[PDB]
């Protein structure tokens, strides 16, 4: 599930809420 953050140049600030960079945007479990 996309969270609402891009990660093309820098990692997900939303890692705090469980989101990780996949395919240039931040996702939690798809």
Author numbering: 1 to 30
Which lines from the publication concern this structure?
Cyclotides are divided into three subfamilies: bracelet, Möbius, and trypsin inhibitor subfamilies. Since cyclotides were first reported two decades ago, studies on bracelet cyclotides have been hampered by their low synthetic yields because of poor oxidative folding efficiency.
Remarkably, the point mutation of Ile to a smaller residue led to a significant improvement in folding yield from negligible amounts for cyO2 to over 50% for the mutant cyO2. We found that when the loop 2 Ile is mutated to Gly, bracelet cyclotides could be folded with high yield, albeit with loss of activity. All [I11G] mutants did not bind the model membrane at peptide concentrations up to 128 µM, except [I11G]hD, which showed an 18-fold weaker affinity to membranes compared to its parent peptide. Their structures were solved using racemic or quasi-racemic crystallography.
